[PDB]
């Protein structure tokens, strides 16, 4: 599961 990095 990847964390948010926009």
């Amino acid at each position, epitope marked *: 599961a*990847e*964390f*948010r990095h926009d």
Partner: antibody, heavy 120, light 113 residues
Framework: QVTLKESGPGILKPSQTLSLTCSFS??????????VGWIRQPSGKGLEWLAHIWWDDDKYYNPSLKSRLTISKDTSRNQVFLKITSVDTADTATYYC????????????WGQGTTLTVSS | DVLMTQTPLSLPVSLGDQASISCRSS???????????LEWYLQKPGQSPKLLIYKVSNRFSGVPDRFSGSGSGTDFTLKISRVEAEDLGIYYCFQSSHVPLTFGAGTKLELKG
């Protein structure tokens, strides 16, 4: 100026519910790219990330606390909340809230922390 | 979960010397967007942790240039040159690529006697 200020009940008995508040200023959770997370530290021990909330309501949780955690926000009041149900001694810790943004993607700002003792 | 293993956990140094801290992730922390989200924090006694380095090698503004991050793959290093007393405390690496976000156990920079 950007500031974060944690508050909590100070002491709880095992089985009670912990309700933490992170009151912030200097930014708004209505602002695109904004987020706040909670991190705790048992004394003399290391840091553990707990939960995270984004300006658009996306929430992330650490599976290590199972269904015990709930994060929420009131952008109107500049507050982020963390609820932890069924506390036990292992929840004794200092709790920090900290900010990250999409354009400054790192925990540059932390609160001073709120300390919790769980004991019977 | 990604395990972050730091070495050593206790690091004695003479003032003015260089300290080197190792941090290894148990699996890749290269995000799908191509960046490696490895951060270093310093916690001084009685204080909240403070940011030093982000994305492996980028110094946060206001951080002295004596702090420098480097690495490749899953092996990371924080270098502290010309150590000053104010640098003493606990250093943590941290990956934010994957959920749950995870810290290393912390390395205490201490004095030689």
């Amino acid at each position: 100026q950007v500031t974060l200020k944690e508050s909590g009940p100070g002491i709880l008995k095992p089985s009670q519910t912990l309700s933490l508040t992170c009151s912030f200023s200097g930014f708004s959770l209505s602002t695109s790219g904004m987020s706040v997370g909670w991190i705790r530290q048992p004394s003399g021990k290391g840091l553990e990330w707990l939960a995270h909330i984004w300006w658009d309501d996306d929430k992330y949780y650490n599976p290590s606390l199972k269904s015990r955690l709930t994060i929420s926000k009131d952008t109107s009041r500049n507050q982020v909340f963390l609820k932890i149900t069924s506390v036990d001694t292992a929840d004794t810790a200092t709790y920090y809230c900290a900010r990250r943004t999409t354009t400054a993607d790192y925990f540059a700002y932390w609160g001073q922390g709120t300390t919790l003792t769980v004991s019977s | 979960d990604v395990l972050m293993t730091q070495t050593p956990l206790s690091l004695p140094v003479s003032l003015g010397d260089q300290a080197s801290i190792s941090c290894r992730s148990s699996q890749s922390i290269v995000h799908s967007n191509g960046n490696t989200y490895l951060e270093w924090y310093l916690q001084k006694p009685g204080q909240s942790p403070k940011l030093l380095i982000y994305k492996v090698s980028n110094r946060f503004s206001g951080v002295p240039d004596r702090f420098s991050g480097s690495g490749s793959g899953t092996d990371f290093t924080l270098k502290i040159s010309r150590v000053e007393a104010e640098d003493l405390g606990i250093y943590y690496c941290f990956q934010s690529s994957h959920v749950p976000l995870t810290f290393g156990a912390g390395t205490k920079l201490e004095l030689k006697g």
